[PDB]
């Protein structure tokens, strides 16, 4: 009968792509017809987000995504065609963590010197972002919120010639992912003072995380979602948040999202549903104290 | 006819872009049985009040006195407007106003030319205040930045008194403001005005260069004052109104009153103030392409 | 050598600033001490007001104010704390014309198809005003009882935000002040059918009155009002009534005037106050039947 | 020179202490080839302004015109500040407003000396408003306490607006406010002004006393408004400052100008100037110091 | 305890809010042996006579059974209030009825997925009628308008009738009523009702579905009768009238009673009782925000 | 080995410096290197304060303070070297409660007759304050709030001028702790109406509290906390928090503690985080209506 279909509201290639293929071949045993995997890209996710939140509310059309269709959107564009509050929660997939990345000559040695020296030089300290919004910039605006520092932005159209400047100096800091500065960190180019999760990275296992090192609050992972249209059944999305946390116990899917910096989460709905609340709340309380709404 | 001209200044009253026509039509009053109505209709970088007086009768009884925004920018700017500044029938300059170039002053240079350096051996690490995107202060950075080969890393403000501020304290390095904005604090050591960007010196603060004597001819960014009828009125109507505005700034307790708001008069005929109006158009088309802005 | 003082009882800028500033200017020649103006705005003119209605009635503190503590608030608020029919009158300075403002969609192109139009469609037109009480809603009212037409109201915390809709086709009528909407008018977002007066403004040379259109009894303008407190003395009342109608004779004054779209007055104390009786009654009237 | 005139107000637009400059400045102007600038510079008391003025060339184009604050007073008031009153260079005193006694009509008292026997037999039952610690109407108010020998209650307020709302509400008892603010309450009933601070009657109310008239001489408390140049500026550029300011002040529509505003014109030479505002400094430097005790 | 219970219901006879509570009288008066008052006064939206009970002594003998107006909101929306609602100490909800979105037949939509989707694509376009700000109607209006992010024009209405005229006659297009007032009209065709804000459809017109059930679980807007005691009852003497109610309101005739006012039982506990009341409180207090600016 | 040291951001000899030594003494069993305690006084506790903030967050050195420092400084100051958000609580030693204290002569003998007096005549009644921020302001408004009447705010530079004006009649309530007014009250010269607290307070066995008069939500304490460095492990918090509970539960503690109008709590180090949280919301709401 009929496929599943998966819309990945972004471009192929990337994490936001991955994981949701790798889930789809484990579970394509659970569908007679199959499961496709589409790349619907555009503004931010939301164009990929409209065509899903419109389908039937069946648990055949599902939205695979990081968190801007899910928690960020509604609070940072002036207006949406669709309401993140009424997606139907299936499961988180994974998370990964973001970090702060330095400049090697910023004459600092640690994340309590590197404070120390950005408070003692308000808005001489520049940090790189994605534009306004993204992720790298919501959590420079987390961090000097938490911190009570002010960081100069200088935003990028992407993560490539962010890290060019990082390493060239042109910029000081970069709040990246873990995926993408740690090679840059193993050959000397950058400095990784902190990961801003509950637990350290297997890509980096010496890399302390902010908690270590006595900012506990300072949590900032993207987590990849699975949600369904507004009106799916609570039992239509349990059958399929199972299907796909059963996908997720495998060692070799868990491998291939430790390789993409991830970490398997294949939570049930409702705790998948408690954790958008709350990343949703924590995000707006971030996009309001520091005025950015696109 | 006994019905009034209207003006229409698409900015909040007080500022520069009020002053400079309200002080005109006191003079040409005389011209106008009916009088003289100044209008502010605020709203969208002069947008909103541009349209209204876009879509006016061409009989030359409503003109619009602007900065220029909705005269020669905001076109190049904008994703989409309501109007073609391209089609405004051109009336007269009212005057000019010069931007200058204000460093901190810790900032560990004496001179334009060591300023350049210094910027030149640190790319992108000294910071300069701006009023957004496609503010004149924005694009006046911008010009200088592609003139000279210097990167400067941009810090918007929501107004001008938040980044004097910061300029002062040392948390942004350099400004493009304009001379009477800056010349207060310039004198009282808290900043330092490194050069005008204008043909001239400036006779609010005789001593301060310009680029031009500094070896940088082309750094050439002023606030030009306009005023421009909808489109269709004719090129007798318009000369007619630029005559009575040319006699008005004529005066020397005018010209006084614009000397205060560091203008100059100008009231240039309508041949002579459509070809500024497509050069400076040009110009800063060229500075927002190179900038992508 | 005592000052004249004159209360303002609204903010500074509007015409019901200028034109008692302009007026000031001229007769600062009578008074050795010169001549103060304030602004004391409150409560619709009547903070203010007050503050005159208890001055001493020596003429040398007077309240120059638009309608409302003049001819309205004591039919409209539920108590005052003055009486208007003891202001002692001084003069009307001018008066500024209020007008029919239609959004241009409407499928109505002079007065007299409107007023058609509106009766073959009972309460389907929106009209905009900004409360109950406020001069749109009057003048409204009044259009509504003599042309016997059926308007359906919507109200507007202020005229921005009315313009707004009338120009987006969200209402379709307001009965606005022509100073207003002139430059809408002009720009073609919004279209004035008539104005409420016995001339045409010279700010629109070109839109008729409601009286060359067979409806003379639409008589709504805003006008600019001088009274002293209770007990001045007619001659009093006089001698301040004589010095601003010279005032008001001089070209240029009567030019910034017009640039308000006001034109200028300068009436006997016993014109203004049959003026103001009329008015007065004429409201009172108009309140009564709406509010039915 | 062609560089305009100067005058920094450090205060906002719209009261008297810009209105007055204002005044003057328009009738300087013919004497200035480049015109008169006046800026607002608010911020802390004046001293913002203040600041601004004292770091500039001290060649008699920037000038300070200013109520007492950083003329007089703030150096005892404040802490630290970041210059020195006593170095500026007086150029003249353009007018006095002076304070006057306020009460609520409900005191049983009906004349001033009432009033203070009325005080005396009741110590610290009176209340009296403020502006705050170090503003006019607290210093005023404490001079009428050290001289009378009277104890009142004090209760601050943020402005004068909702001071004279509890003071005709009967929730303060007295306020020591500026004739021009509070004359027209006093006319509608709403308070009783009991006497005038100052030398003569003022013509806003011919009929209310001074202090003076009713054995108080002592009781002198005006707000002063004075124009000042940096330290440096030569006595000879002082003077002829002064000069051209006091034929502006003699006209006869400055005089009526100033009464509106409660204002008279004085316009005396920078010696009397100099000894004006070290008197005054020294009375307000002692109310302070025995207030603070 | 030969005291009869007194409950004032503040609105006037007639009403489901007076019917309600004369029926839950005719069931407790076995509970009191001085019998059972019902007094109705109205005025000022439920405050005057919510006033007289707040005063009243805290021995529950004297209770207020009221829809929300002086139980959840008028402390939100009036400016100020001589009691404060949320020192009522609960005694239970009575019973609820539902509000629903009615519409003019001629609108081109069939459902309430159309009609928000015709609402989003002409904004402002689609009129609403209110009782005035503050109302039920208007208040539901503004949580749809939130939640769908849609915008209406109001109009305004003395009262459900006038509203219902227009609506009718197509002189207004939507509007969000209870369903007891807009059924019989429903029934005839006179307008639409195409959703009922609850959480499950109401018995009145079982064929009309919730907002819950397509896809709008959101849109729960009820007007809730309410019992509550003055400050300071105690817990003990409130859950002793709950229970005498809930008895009550368990009787087979007085349920079929209350829906034929359109209303479901209740009968909640105090807890649970206070716990609804917050919420709504909670809730109404955001769409009063939200909506007035 | 090394003394556990407590900063107490205060001067010696008050009620902050006096409990914090009371439990050392019982604690120095538990430690072999004895307690030290400081007194570090200076700008509301921010001095001491910041003192602890940069120490190692080795259970060694620990701040024990009243409010200040703990809850309502960064809503209060324009800037703080240290984030009080970032403590690591550890315990809440003990509170003790403000009370409504007002001159004998107003004519009102309960709480309710006040707040009724006070509601007939706004801004008749004046209240005492130690300046913008003090507890007696930050109690005094959250009066305001909670019950709506409207006070007149007179500013002392201390206790002792405000009592001395309560007692003479020139101001007319005062919100001061229990143990600096119940002397006064037992003379006559004051009068208490009500304590700000969940029970009566054993000073005066006869008074009542806010919540037995229907305002409980009116609760109004100065509560003692212990909190440590940021980074402090929750498991040295619970060790220290355990010594200092047992050294809380002797009655003789009791007894001392009563004697500055203090009740002991040794709560854990989560009831403990919870209470500063409600705490610092809800003086921050105070703060910002107040101001406005």
Same mark, same amino acid.
């Given at each position: 009968? #009929?496929?599943?279909?998966?819309?990945?509201?972004?471009?192929?290639?990337?994490?936001?792509? !991955?994981?949701?293929?790798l889930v789809a071949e484990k579970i394509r045993a659970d569908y007679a017809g199959g499961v496709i995997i589409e790349n619907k890209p555009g503004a931010g996710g939301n164009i990929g987000a409209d065509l899903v939140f419109r389908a039937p509310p069946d648990g055949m059309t599902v939205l695979a995504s990081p968190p801007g269709p899910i928690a960020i959107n509604h609070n940072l564009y002036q207006k949406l065609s669709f309401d993140p509050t009424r997606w139907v929660p299936?499961?988180?997939?994974? &998370?990964?963590?973001? !970090?702060?990345?330095?400049?090697?000559?910023?004459?600092?040695?640690?994340?309590? %010197?590197?404070?120390?020296?950005?408070?003692?030089?308000?808005?001489?300290? @520049?940090?790189? @972002?994605?534009? +306004?919004?993204?992720?790298?910039?919501? &959590?420079?605006?987390?961090?000097?919120?938490?911190?009570?520092?002010? *960081?100069?932005?200088?935003?990028?159209?992407?993560?490539?010639?962010?890290?060019?400047?990082?390493?060239?100096?042109?910029? +000081?800091?970069?709040?990246?992912?873990?995926?993408?500065?740690? &090679?840059?960190?193993?050959?000397?180019?950058?400095?990784?003072?902190?990961?801003?999760?509950? #637990?350290?990275?297997?890509?980096?296992?010496? !890399?302390?995380?902010?908690?270590?090192?006595?900012?506990?609050?300072?949590?900032? !992972?993207?987590?990849?979602?699975?949600?369904?249209?507004?009106?799916? /059944?609570? %039992?239509?999305?349990?059958?399929?948040?199972?299907?796909?946390? *059963?996908? *997720? /116990?495998?060692?070799?899917?868990?491998?291939?999202?430790?390789? #993409?910096?991830?970490?398997?989460?294949?939570?049930?709905?409702?705790? &998948?549903?408690?954790?958008?609340?709350?990343?949703?709340?924590?995000?707006?309380?971030?996009?309001?104290?520091?005025?950015?709404?696109?």
């Amino acid at each position: 009968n #009929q496929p599943l279909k998966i819309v990945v509201p972004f471009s192929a290639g990337g994490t936001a792509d !991955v994981l949701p293929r790798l889930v789809a071949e484990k579970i394509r045993a659970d569908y007679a017809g199959g499961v496709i995997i589409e790349n619907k890209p555009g503004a931010g996710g939301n164009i990929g987000a409209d065509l899903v939140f419109r389908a039937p509310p069946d648990g055949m059309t599902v939205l695979a995504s990081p968190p801007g269709p899910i928690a960020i959107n509604h609070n940072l564009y002036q207006k949406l065609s669709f309401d993140p509050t009424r997606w139907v929660p299936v499961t988180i997939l994974a &998370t990964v963590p973001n !970090v702060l990345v330095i400049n090697p000559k910023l004459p600092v040695k640690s994340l309590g %010197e590197f404070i120390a020296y950005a408070k003692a030089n308000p808005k001489k300290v @520049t940090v790189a @972002t994605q534009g +306004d919004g993204s992720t790298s910039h919501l &959590t420079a605006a987390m961090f000097m919120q938490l911190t009570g520092t002010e *960081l100069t932005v200088i935003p990028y159209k992407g993560t490539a010639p962010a890290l060019i400047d990082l390493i060239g100096g042109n910029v +000081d800091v970069f709040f990246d992912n873990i995926s993408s500065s740690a &090679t840059y960190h193993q050959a000397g180019k950058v400095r990784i003072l902190a990961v801003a999760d509950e #637990q350290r990275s297997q890509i980096l296992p010496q !890399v302390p995380t902010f908690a270590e090192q006595q900012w506990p609050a300072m949590q900032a !992972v993207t987590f990849f979602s699975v949600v369904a249209p507004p009106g799916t /059944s609570a %039992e239509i999305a349990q059958k399929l948040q199972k299907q796909m946390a *059963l996908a *997720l /116990s495998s060692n070799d899917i868990r491998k291939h999202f430790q390789e #993409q910096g991830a970490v398997p989460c294949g939570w049930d709905p409702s705790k &998948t549903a408690q954790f958008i609340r709350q990343e949703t709340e924590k995000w707006k309380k971030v996009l309001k104290a520091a005025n950015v709404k696109l």
